């Protein structure tokens with residue numbers, strides 16, 4: 001058993017975490033990727049989608065096919081890795 005923390009606490013605005021799995025963007029594994037739309041998702045989630053897709057990945061948010069054969073092709077999202085937010 002492991003638990004014990006305070007709830008009803010939400011201050012962070014940035015999306016340092018994935019809007020899907022909600023896991024801290026960790027280069028080691030979960031690498032933050034930016035779609036041609038703007039939304040940021042961890043390569044992990046993007047992979048599950050790309051796998052099937054062939055002519056681009058369909059964003060589960062806006063649904064903007066990301067014509068990219070490789071995970072690096074799309075727009076990189078190092079903003080989450082950078083120290084703090086980029087734009088306020």
Ligand SMILES: [Zn+2]
Pocket residue numbers: 018019020021022023041042044045046
């Ligand atoms: Zn994810």
Ligand SMILES: [Zn+2]
Pocket residue numbers: 035037038039059060061062063064
């Ligand atoms: Zn999107």
